[PDB]
Amino acid sequence: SYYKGQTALHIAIERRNMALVTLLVENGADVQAAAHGDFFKKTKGRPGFYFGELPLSLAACTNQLGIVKFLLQNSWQTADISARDSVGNTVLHALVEVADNTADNTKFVTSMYNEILMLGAKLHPTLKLEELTNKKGMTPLALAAGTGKIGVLAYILQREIQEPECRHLSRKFTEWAYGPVHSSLYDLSCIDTCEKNSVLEVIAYSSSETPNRHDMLLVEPLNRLLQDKWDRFVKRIFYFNFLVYCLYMIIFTMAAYYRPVDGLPPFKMEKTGDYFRVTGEILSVLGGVYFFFRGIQYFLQRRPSMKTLFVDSYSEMLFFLQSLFMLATVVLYFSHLKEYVASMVFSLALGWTNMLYYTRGFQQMGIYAVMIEKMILRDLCRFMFVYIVFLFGFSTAVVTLIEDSYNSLYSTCLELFKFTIGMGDLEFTENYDFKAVFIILLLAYVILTYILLLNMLIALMGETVNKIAQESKNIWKLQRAITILDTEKSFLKCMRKAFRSGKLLQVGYTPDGKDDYRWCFRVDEVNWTTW
Amino acid sequence: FVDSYSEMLFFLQSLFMLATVVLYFSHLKEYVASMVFSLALGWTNMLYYTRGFQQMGIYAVMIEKMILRDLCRFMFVYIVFLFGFSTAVVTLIEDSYNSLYSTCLELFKFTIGMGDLEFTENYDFKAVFIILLLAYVILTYILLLNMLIALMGETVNKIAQESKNIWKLQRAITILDTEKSFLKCMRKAFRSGKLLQVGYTPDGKDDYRWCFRVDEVNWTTW
Amino acid sequence: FVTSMYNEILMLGAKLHPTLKLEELTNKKGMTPLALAAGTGKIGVLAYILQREIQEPECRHLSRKFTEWAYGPVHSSLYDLSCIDTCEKNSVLEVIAYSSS
Amino acid sequence: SYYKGQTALHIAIERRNMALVTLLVENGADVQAAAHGDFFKKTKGRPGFYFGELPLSLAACTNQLGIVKFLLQNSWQTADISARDSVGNTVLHALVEVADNTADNTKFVTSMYNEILMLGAKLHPTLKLEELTNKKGMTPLALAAGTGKIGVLAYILQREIQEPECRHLSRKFTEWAYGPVHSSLYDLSCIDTCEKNSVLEVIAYSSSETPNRHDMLLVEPLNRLLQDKWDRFVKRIFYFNFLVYCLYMIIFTMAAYYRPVDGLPPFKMEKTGDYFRVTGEILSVLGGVYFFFRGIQYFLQRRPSMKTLFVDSYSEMLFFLQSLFMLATVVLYFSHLKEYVASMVFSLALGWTNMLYYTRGFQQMGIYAVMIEKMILRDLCRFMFVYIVFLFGFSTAVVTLIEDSYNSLYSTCLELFKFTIGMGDLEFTENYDFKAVFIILLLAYVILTYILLLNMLIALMGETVNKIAQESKNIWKLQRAITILDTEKSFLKCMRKAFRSGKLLQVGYTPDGKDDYRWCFRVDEVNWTTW
Ligand SMILES: CC(C)CCC[C@@H](C)[C@H]1CC[C@H]2[C@@H]3CC=C4C[C@@H](O)CC[C@]4(C)[C@H]3CC[C@]12C
Ligand SMILES: CC(C)CCC[C@@H](C)[C@H]1CC[C@H]2[C@@H]3CC=C4C[C@@H](O)CC[C@]4(C)[C@H]3CC[C@]12C
Ligand SMILES: CC(C)CCC[C@@H](C)[C@H]1CC[C@H]2[C@@H]3CC=C4C[C@@H](O)CC[C@]4(C)[C@H]3CC[C@]12C
Numbered sequence A, D: 001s002y003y004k005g006q007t008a009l010h011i012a013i014e015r016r017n018m019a020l021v022t023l024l025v026e027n028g029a030d031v032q033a034a035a036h037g038d039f040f041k042k043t044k045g046r047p048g049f050y051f052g053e054l055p056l057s058l059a060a061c062t063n064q065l066g067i068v069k070f071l072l073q074n075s076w077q078t079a080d081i082s083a084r085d086s087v088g089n090t091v092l093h094a095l096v097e098v099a100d101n102t103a104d105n106t107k108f109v110t111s112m113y114n115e116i117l118m119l120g121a122k123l124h125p126t127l128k129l130e131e132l133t134n135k136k137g138m139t140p141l142a143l144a145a146g147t148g149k150i151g152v153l154a155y156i157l158q159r160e161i162q163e164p165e166c167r168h169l170s171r172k173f174t175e176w177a178y179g180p181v182h183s184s185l186y187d188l189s190c191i192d193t194c195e196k197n198s199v200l201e202v203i204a205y206s207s208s209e210t211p212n213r214h215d216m217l218l219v220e221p222l223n224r225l226l227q228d229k230w231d232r233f234v235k236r237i238f239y240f241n242f243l244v245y246c247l248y249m250i251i252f253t254m255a256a257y258y259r260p261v262d263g264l265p266p267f268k269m270e271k272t273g274d275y276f277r278v279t280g281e282i283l284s285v286l287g288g289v290y291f292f293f294r295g296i297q298y299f300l301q302r303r304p305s306m307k308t309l310f311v312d313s314y315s316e317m318l319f320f321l322q323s324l325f326m327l328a329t330v331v332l333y334f335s336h337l338k339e340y341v342a343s344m345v346f347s348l349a350l351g352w353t354n355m356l357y358y359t360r361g362f363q364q365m366g367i368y369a370v371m372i373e374k375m376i377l378r379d380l381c382r383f384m385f386v387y388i389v390f391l392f393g394f395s396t397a398v399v400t401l402i403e404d405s406y407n408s409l410y411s412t413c414l415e416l417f418k419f420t421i422g423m424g425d426l427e428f429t430e431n432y433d434f435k436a437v438f439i440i441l442l443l444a445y446v447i448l449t450y451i452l453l454l455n456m457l458i459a460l461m462g463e464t465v466n467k468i469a470q471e472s473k474n475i476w477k478l479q480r481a482i483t484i485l486d487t488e489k490s491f492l493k494c495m496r497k498a499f500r501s502g503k504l505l506q507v508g509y510t511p512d513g514k515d516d517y518r519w520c521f522r523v524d525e526v527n528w529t530t531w
Numbered sequence B: 001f002v003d004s005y006s007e008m009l010f011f012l013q014s015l016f017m018l019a020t021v022v023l024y025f026s027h028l029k030e031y032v033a034s035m036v037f038s039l040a041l042g043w044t045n046m047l048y049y050t051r052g053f054q055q056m057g058i059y060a061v062m063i064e065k066m067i068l069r070d071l072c073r074f075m076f077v078y079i080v081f082l083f084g085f086s087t088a089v090v091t092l093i094e095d096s097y098n099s100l101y102s103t104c105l106e107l108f109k110f111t112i113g114m115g116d117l118e119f120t121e122n123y124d125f126k127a128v129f130i131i132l133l134l135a136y137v138i139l140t141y142i143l144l145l146n147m148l149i150a151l152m153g154e155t156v157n158k159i160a161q162e163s164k165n166i167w168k169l170q171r172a173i174t175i176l177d178t179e180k181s182f183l184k185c186m187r188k189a190f191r192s193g194k195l196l197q198v199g200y201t202p203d204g205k206d207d208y209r210w211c212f213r214v215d216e217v218n219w220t221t222w
Numbered sequence C: 001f002v003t004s005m006y007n008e009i010l011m012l013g014a015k016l017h018p019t020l021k022l023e024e025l026t027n028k029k030g031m032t033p034l035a036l037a038a039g040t041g042k043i044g045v046l047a048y049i050l051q052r053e054i055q056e057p058e059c060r061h062l063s064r065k066f067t068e069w070a071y072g073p074v075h076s077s078l079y080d081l082s083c084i085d086t087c088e089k090n091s092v093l094e095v096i097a098y099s100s101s
């Protein structure tokens, strides 16, 4: 099973001998026979090499351009350019998975991808290779975006083939030109709108394990497509949602502020301010109900893996968690428990903290919020672990020294914490023996945490800012891109016609002769060189 | 003390623990004094296990560099100012902070953001008292403390790339220490690699070497 | 310079003294050249010795970095690993780790 | 007077024509005639060009190597290679002043300096050109160090001349050699010991206007000469002075600490602690007298310009000021005034701050102190100016708002200053009208000074650290070098024989044939290339 299905034709291509493969083809050796061996499969837990499980793909994946043309343009036995393995990966799919985003492999794969598309048009004019999907139902374009192959995704998106009768395989066209000025179109098909896997959908709705999902939106069609989606309709809908949440969170703030302080809720209706407060309290629960149902609407439609629900898209959880706090308030309010206030102030504090969601849509706010994110997961977490070891380590030493009031682990942890915030007493208690021991414990704690730990946290954040400053504009654009796609799905949901980016334009001719119309996106470039 | 101070600090805590037992059975109340230093050092010794975690270990390596490169330089100059101005202040104070300890503590509180600036009025020449405190504040708080943050940032910048190599060395010493202590009977179940035929002795005998496998992928040099 | 001069004097020793193993010889301090390079911090020659691959037949047994097999872009390379983690007196890992800073 | 003294021979060399100058020399035109024109002088307040006021130096300063050889190796009229202008600058002096430390000029001057030394040996074997001093009494070597010409100072110090019969003009010799190893000597004459102007003395005792005085000690002979002067004898004398000052400043601390608090000094003698305290008080005045006389000893021997006494050598000023405080203390003590306590606590604080002088002699302490000085002179002054503007403005506004107790400009300046140190009340007074005005004034002050000014001072120091980190090891070495030379002058002062660096060694032969002995400094270098 380790090499099951392997034929002598596989070894000839493996050894890189064009004469040896010719003899086997001449003798009738099977060319479509597939090596369904685990060594030839991915099998990430074991060493091996994946190439597409086909002799034809072996030549393509091993830079054997002649053997690819040999297996297709010969006379004895012509290989199938549309052949799919057990996984269903076409040779185009195999070329995508071989790519590993390094400099040399990208030039390799994007080249071999070109001619095998060029050859297929000459040999199978009516067949469209890229439209074929594997058993996973992913086209090579969708697989490159899914697996993070930015090197070949950039190639496919802005592909232009100069040679006639195969120009219709191109994706980046040209409407016209001038002296220094030329306007170039983009195919834009299966990019923003598609049946199953759009390029924008797969790049945005990734699991954060994708290598270059931030930079995959930087390729030329995607950045301008998302930016114009923002400017056309998404920006105003986002600003409307921002205003509604601000209005909702101010109504909730005033209803909580003017809550009655008498016992045993619910509270009876009196005067005129109670009807205004209950009015604002009804709208608060409605917003809590809306954010509760929008959360499960998010869980059912995207099915998070419980790993990409806390690291990414935690904003969805924190909005859902606030709704949970709001619904718990209503349960406790009608249960006559005073603990409804405890849940209501956590819903109030989290609800106002959730106002930081809308820092995307503003470039300087969004980049700032992306940097705030990086500190918590890179600097604050490391600081707090070491700080809590010191804080709990010295508090237990101090409270053991304290005798017969700070003789409590909580009262001592609070006094030592005040040192962090510039409010350290250093003489908060005198109820002990061994005053020298007490002073040495506090002075050691002060030097280790205040002078050393806190000042070094500032030094570490500056190092974090330096590295992430250039890249944080790409995380923000990804965060806004997810907002752009989420807005489209929620808003239109009836016709999907007013937000159509680009326009249907005649780009060329089908090789049969029919007119091909592609929803194309226009980009104008100016070059003062290459006249 | 420079390297393997973790062994010293773990041994020193044990010395504090054994001194506690000596004083506990000697009927001295000072066993508590030794026991809280054993408690505080024992919890500080919990930072030994920050190795074995990459981001914790690199963080702990950077913490170590500050103490031996930035904190030590700062404390020498700071203590000169602290003791230099405390003696000037406590000498001005008359007939209660008229103690070198009580004045060193008041001037230290300025460092931690708790400086009174009016803690005592028992002196003559109020202008002298204010000029001494304002000079101390500007020299240590505005200048010395803010410059320590500036120096740590320069230390972080230089050691950021290299600190992944000190951590791996620290974990490597832990890896070898674990091997020696754990097995210590057979040394068979933890051996790396495997005996594999690599070639032939020039005489003609088969040579078997415990070899470690590495797989590399190169898309150039076909 | 050194990693070259070290090479041929090993190649020549194989041709001239096939039965003799030069690297196994220890000085009065009881340290082999491999252990001495790790002890004294000679990373330039320690890197050479550890992944030494000699192409010459009849001299290939002096290599320390072998090759199990190969593929188109893929090749698996072995390493001698002898006197590295386990050794009688001075392992490379032991001497590098148990240094004096 | 603008071009007075200029001859036609000057114009021919100016125009760079070797044929034209030949005709004038053939016709008897004066070659030693000097153009004593202000346009040909330095005259930094007016445009011009200085070249040495001689036709021969014009060729040297204008890269006219042939004309230099023409004016010296011809038959009709030979120019004087030892000719000096009105300022007395020899052509070697002129070449030094032309150099401006740029990359191309250094190759220019250090070359032209070489061959004009070549010709002098061949044409005037008994004459020594470099030993000639101008009207200022400075040799070309001393002038290059004085004016900051590091490019040519490096050339002169480590000069090796390959030509036989010209090798005795070299300054960097070679004792022997090995395979990769070779030991090279250095002339070391007029470097550490000289009659008037040593290279070490002039570089160290500069006015801080010299361009590269920090880097002028980095040239190969000077760094190792000063480092070995440190290790031989200066280091232990410095550590002895550090210990004596520590002992003196602790005796002074204890005498001040245990001062009697009764009225009307001097105080009578009782018990046994008063004799111990007066003993410590006698030694305190003696140290004050010693630092007073050492200060004037510094003023008389070096004569500071009152500009290089505050920016550089402020350590001398601060020690002298502490001595002045001590003498004022004695005067007030014997005048029965209580203000001796004020003068003496100022003396105590300044004397303990003076303990930072001895941070030189320790590399890390010295670099740290140099960085502290850079902060004080670069960031702290700017911050204090802007901060004092803000503090005074808002304090005047607040104390004007305050009515009928913080109704004092001092009491309000102190309350607003406490905000800087993390002790700001924000509610220190309620004796006013217009509570909103009071809050807006304080909140504006807090945001402008605490959140903005203080946090940006930390940001500026980090930028200062980044730039000065590499160079601060060179300011420290200069500061230690001044300490090394100061120690030599003070310590030996009788024989100047035990600290002699290097040794008298036979380097070669005088061109006459006599043995030349130079106090030479040995440096051993290892090169594994150039076999
Ligand atoms: C009572 C409420 C308001 C407390 C304050 C809000 C808290 C819960 C919010 C505000 C900022 C949030 C964090 C922002 C960034 C990150 C990094 C991300 O990769 C994981 C989640 C994490 C770590 C978030 C966790 C929840 C968080 C800490
Ligand atoms: C009472 C106890 C807990 C005091 C706090 C723990 C002290 C003793 C520990 C915590 C961190 C430790 C330091 C960590 C880093 C270094 C750098 C190293 O090259 C020398 C030792 C030195 C300087 C350690 C000395 C001891 C140390 C300061
Ligand atoms: C008597 C009390 C106030 C003593 C306090 C110490 C004061 C006076 C000392 C300590 C540090 C010193 C400074 C250190 C560095 C510099 C930079 C230099 O280019 C000019 C002098 C200057 C600005 C010094 C001025 C005096 C100074 C501020």
Ligand SMILES: CC(C)c1nc2cc(O)ccc2c(=O)n1-c1ccc(C#N)cc1
Residues within 6 Å of the ligand: A314, A315, A318, A319, A350, A353, A354, A355, A356, A357, A358, A359, A360, A366, A367, A369, A370, A372, A373, A475, A476, A477, A479, A480
């Ligand atoms: C950490 C930032 C400030 C943040 N904090 C939140 C807190 C919440 O309670 C809920 C949601 C958020 C939230 O979305 N962000 C966030 C993240 C990325 C971008 C970008 N680009 C914009 C905003």
Ligand SMILES: CC(C)c1nc2cc(O)ccc2c(=O)n1-c1ccc(C#N)cc1
Residues within 6 Å of the ligand: B005, B006, B009, B010, B041, B044, B045, B046, B047, B048, B049, B050, B051, B057, B058, B060, B061, B063, B064, B166, B167, B168, B170, B171
């Ligand atoms: C300074 C750090 C935080 C530290 N502090 C300790 C304190 C003690 O009291 C005892 C031991 C330690 C200790 O080992 N480290 C340390 C050092 C290097 C690495 C790495 N890589 C991991 C941890």
Ligand SMILES: CC(C)c1nc2cc(O)ccc2c(=O)n1-c1ccc(C#N)cc1
Residues within 6 Å of the ligand: D314, D315, D318, D319, D350, D353, D354, D355, D356, D357, D358, D359, D360, D366, D367, D369, D370, D372, D373, D475, D476, D477, D479, D480
């Ligand atoms: C600013 C530093 C801390 C300082 N402060 C002083 C304060 C005084 O009151 C008197 C003298 C000094 C003093 O010399 N330095 C200083 C300067 C340079 C070098 C170097 N290299 C070493 C020390």
